[PDB]
Chain A
Amino acid sequence: SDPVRQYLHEIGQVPLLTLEEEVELARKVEEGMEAIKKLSEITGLDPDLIREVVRAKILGSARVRHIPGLKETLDPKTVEEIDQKLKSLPKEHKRYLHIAREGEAARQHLIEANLRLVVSIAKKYTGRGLSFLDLIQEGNQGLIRAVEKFEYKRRFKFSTYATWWIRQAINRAIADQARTIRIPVHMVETINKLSRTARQLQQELGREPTYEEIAEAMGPGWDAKRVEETLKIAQEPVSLETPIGDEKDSFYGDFIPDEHLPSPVDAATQSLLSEELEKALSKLSEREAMVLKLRKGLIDGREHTLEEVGAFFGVTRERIRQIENKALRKLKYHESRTRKLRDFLD
């Protein structure tokens, strides 16, 4: 029913490691990685492909999918070929395979055992724009990074090194996903810094600070305009479904006109404009009207050069320019005469 409760149950299933269990798991993981590198040395194959194969057989055929980094599409066929190629190796070499498998299994068990930490850390990041479950999952990504990067040699407990990467992943998630209009992480940092600055400033000023005071507190490079524009780009959008009035019958979006699609008046005006332009062009001859329509783009929509209309009508560019000139001139005279195209000039 409640997804969080359900997940907390599934997490409550796997029991917490002891110091020895943790050390052994980490050790098996590390030695497993070493073994994969060794198998890469021996076989002369790609360490990543080998890792994906070992992980494939450990996880089973329940999960097999093409890895973005891998060169070959990963399917039961290819993993069977590679597995059999790994079965083809001498006892001391074939040993490293077992080391690798044990490594993967240890990795899985390590993550699964440490899933609680992620929750305990993520519970404090709520209200920041991401759901609890999302924070948890991103934190889980962090946990995975921590597992693959851990060194048991340092004798530090796993939680210490894990927490760093977990917080890292949660915060990266918050910075990346939380805005309908996405903002770069460094810019989000600058914006939050501006917020904290303004909040401290207001905490000592007994009022909201001006742009100038914030600019002062931000240091050199920061003036009022920079603070103002930074606050401008930080603005988040508002819902079109935002309710208006105490009833349920009015949306905020109902008050917003469409500026894109031309109005009936605008359309009709463009129509009468085209018709009138044709009327005026019909007082010219075929050639000068056509030259004008070509140069101004009434024909294909593009505006032809003098050399194009000149090569089209078979005259010099000077000539075509001259007939364009006289065309425009006759149009000017007729326009002064009938005053027909004047009203379309606004």
Chain B
Amino acid sequence: TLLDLSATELEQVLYFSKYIVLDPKGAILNGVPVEKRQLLTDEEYRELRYGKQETYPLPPGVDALVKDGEEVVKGQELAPGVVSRLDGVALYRFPRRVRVEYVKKERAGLRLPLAAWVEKEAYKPGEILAELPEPYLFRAEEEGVVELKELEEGAFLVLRREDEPVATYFLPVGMTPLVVHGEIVEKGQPLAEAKGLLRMPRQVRAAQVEAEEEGETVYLTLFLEWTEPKDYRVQPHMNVVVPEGARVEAGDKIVAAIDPEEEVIAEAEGVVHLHEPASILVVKARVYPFEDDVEVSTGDRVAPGDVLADGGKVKSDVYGRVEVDLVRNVVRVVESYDIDARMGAEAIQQLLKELDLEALEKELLEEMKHPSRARRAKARKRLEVVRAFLDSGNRPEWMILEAVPVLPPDLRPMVQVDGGRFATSDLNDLYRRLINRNNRLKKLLAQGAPEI
């Protein structure tokens, strides 16, 4: 009656069915702003206080249609069998395999008929290298054993006489190699056949082009740059210590593990790609990558216009809770209000302390002049309690117990009956329940127990 709370509601708050809000800090549920003494469910309080998020399963063998760190809109399919019910930043959970694209910058020669070759200072991927009217046989200018390295498209030949390579030839798309791996070739025997138009592969680009005119032919020394993929399998007991698209060097570790021999170490300079996550986590959050030391740690709560990282450069957009990602090197703010919503007799005691009696008496007095009979009735019933407390000098919050009194022991005896057996009052068992639960509560608090 005092706080204007129906029996069901007070039941819900005292017995921890529902939260009640104090100093809402401007939370918003379903478009409607939040004001004091509002009744929030568990899902509502969790969405408001801890932010909104979800995780989705990926069936075995299927890969992602989205990338790590990438913003996502509701309805957008993360997989063929997975559609996100919300909008936000998708994140990878437990990638099964890590692909590493290894950077390789080398030098390789080729010889072509002068009429066919289209002269350029460099060649972009896919760009036509030459146009040949008739089939042409590219021949070995050295003797030795052939190392055939085949890319997705395009090939490399390496002639090594001594086991020391004496030659490197590049075979762009349109040239079918006539040699196998480890084949012994003499000088001037065809290593390949060029047919029609020959062009650069999509995997490899030609950075520099030198050309020596000799007789009716040109010899192109090509300075090439390309990436070679290598797949690594990650077991459930292993974790990925490297972010998506991270530049790595020889000696660095991509994936850790229980024991050092099963670890994944990077063999050469290359970029890291995370594929086939166990699950995908969609969160409503704002991403803030950082290039330097971060001013706020994990768990801190922050408003828009707050210091985050890099000595005060990158700041906060929305309201939320700070998760500092060292792996991805990004400060990620999951959007959540600071709203204070409590449960139980502590909340109630707080609201009770916050009642100004004279004010409420005035309110109810102004309510007593209303034409409606029911309103006058309820206002009378309330004003009776209000004026009871007012006249008495009793503080309303005394209807909550901080300290539970204990009856004198002789009024709840423990007595030895005739036969030496003991008989005692139930009040002792009640008090023992009370003290056990209270003590366990203090120990659970001191030990930092979870909220449930």
Q: Which one of A56-64, A214-222, A284-292, A313-321 is at the interface?
A: A56-64
Q: Is the beta-carbon distance between B415 and A256 smaller than 8 angstroms?
A: yes
Scan A1-28; emit 1 where CB is below 8 A from any B CB, else 0.
0000011001101100011110110010
Q: Which residues of chain B are within 8 angstroms of A102 by Cβ–Cβ distance?
A: 298
Q: B119 within 8 Å of A by Cβ?
A: no
Q: B247 within 8 Å of A by Cβ?
A: no
Residue on B nearest A56 in the bound complex, by CB = B448
Q: A115 within 8 Å of B by Cβ?
A: yes
Q: Is the beta-carbon distance between A240 and B413 smaller than 8 angstroms?
A: yes
Which residues of chain B in 113-154 are interfacial with respect to chain A, using CB atoms and an 8 Å cutoff?
none
Q: Is the beta-carbon distance between B299 and A23 smaller than 8 angstroms?
A: no
Q: A63-B445, A180-B432 are in contact. Are A6 and B297 (CB under 8 A)?
A: no
Q: B313 within 8 Å of A by Cβ?
A: no
Q: Is the beta-carbon distance between B423 and A237 smaller than 8 angstroms?
A: yes
Q: Which residues of chain A are within 8 angstroms of B93 by Cβ–Cβ distance?
A: 20-21
Q: Is the beta-carbon distance between A237 and B449 smaller than 8 angstroms?
A: no
Q: Is the beta-carbon distance between B237 and A65 smaller than 8 angstroms?
A: no
Q: Is the beta-carbon distance between B297 and A97 smaller than 8 angstroms?
A: yes
Q: Is the beta-carbon distance between A240 and B425 smaller than 8 angstroms?
A: yes
Q: A252 within 8 Å of B by Cβ?
A: yes
Most buried by A among B16, B278, B324: B324
Which residues of chain B in 407-452 are interfacial with respect to chain A, using CB atoms and an 8 Å cutoff?
413-415, 417, 421-426, 428-429, 432, 436-437, 440, 443-452
Q: How distant is the Cα of A238 from the Cα of B423 in the complex, in angstroms? A: 5
Q: How distant is the Cα of A13 from the Cα of B45 in the complex, in angstroms? A: 13
Q: How distant is the Cα of A153 from the Cα of B256 in the complex, in angstroms? A: 13
| CB-contact partner of B452 in A10, A18, A105, under 8 A | A10
Q: How distant is the Cα of A97 from the Cα of B415 in the complex, in angstroms? A: 58
Q: Is the beta-carbon distance between B237 and A58 smaller than 8 angstroms?
A: no
Q: How distant is the Cα of A208 from the Cα of B159 in the complex, in angstroms? A: 97
Q: B326 within 8 Å of A by Cβ?
A: yes
Interface size for chain A: under 10, 10 to 19, 20 to 34, or 35 or more residues?
35 or more
Which residues of chain A in 89-110 are interfacial with respect to chain B, using CB atoms and an 8 Å cutoff?
91, 94-95, 97-99, 101-102, 104-105, 108
Q: Which one of A138-146, A191-199, A293-301 is at the interface?
A: A138-146
Q: B37 within 8 Å of A by Cβ?
A: no
CB distance from B336 to the nearest CB of A (A): 11
Which residues of chain A in 143-164 are interfacial with respect to chain B, using CB atoms and an 8 Å cutoff?
144, 152-153, 155
Q: Is the beta-carbon distance between A20 and B94 smaller than 8 angstroms?
A: yes
Scan B71-102; emit 1 where CB is below 8 A from any A CB, else 0.
00000000000000000000001100000000
Q: How distant is the Cα of A137 from the Cα of B449 in the complex, in angstroms? A: 11
Q: A340 within 8 Å of B by Cβ?
A: no
| CB-contact partner of B236 in A20, A68, A101, under 8 A | A20
Q: Which residues of chain B are within 8 angstroms of A152 by Cβ–Cβ distance?
A: 237
Q: A27-B239, A108-B450, A155-B237 are in contact. Are A241 and B426 (CB under 8 A)?
A: yes
Q: Which residues of chain B are within 8 angstroms of A181 by Cβ–Cβ distance?
A: 422
Q: Is the beta-carbon distance between A55 and B448 smaller than 8 angstroms?
A: yes
CB distance from A132 to the nearest CB of B (A): 13
CB distance from B45 to the nearest CB of A (A): 12
| CB-contact partner of A256 in B423, B426, B432, under 8 A | B423
Q: A111 within 8 Å of B by Cβ?
A: yes
Q: Which residues of chain B are within 8 angstroms of A19 by Cβ–Cβ distance?
A: 236
Q: A177 within 8 Å of B by Cβ?
A: yes
Residue on A nearest B436 in the bound complex, by CB = A177
Q: A57-B299, A57-B300 are in contact. Are A18 and B278 (CB under 8 A)?
A: yes
Q: Is the beta-carbon distance between A111 and B423 smaller than 8 angstroms?
A: no
Q: How distant is the Cα of A80 from the Cα of B336 in the complex, in angstroms? A: 22
Q: Is the beta-carbon distance between A6 and B17 smaller than 8 angstroms?
A: yes
Q: A263 within 8 Å of B by Cβ?
A: no
Q: How distant is the Cα of A99 from the Cα of B241 in the complex, in angstroms? A: 13
Q: Is the beta-carbon distance between A237 and B426 smaller than 8 angstroms?
A: no
Residue on B nearest A67 in the bound complex, by CB = B446
Q: A95-B326, A98-B297 are in contact. Are A134 and B422 (CB under 8 A)?
A: no
30 A-B pairs, CB-CB below 8 angstroms? A6-B16, A14-B452, A18-B94, A18-B278, A19-B236, A20-B236, A21-B93, A52-B448, A57-B297, A68-B446, A91-B292, A95-B326, A98-B324, A101-B324, A102-B298, A104-B299, A108-B450, A111-B450, A112-B451, A134-B437, A137-B440, A140-B449, A155-B258, A180-B429, A237-B421, A239-B423, A240-B415, A241-B425, A241-B426, A256-B417
Give the top 8 A-B pairs by smallest Cβ distance, nearest first. Answer: A101-B298, A237-B422, A20-B94, A58-B299, A91-B293, A55-B448, A112-B450, A237-B424
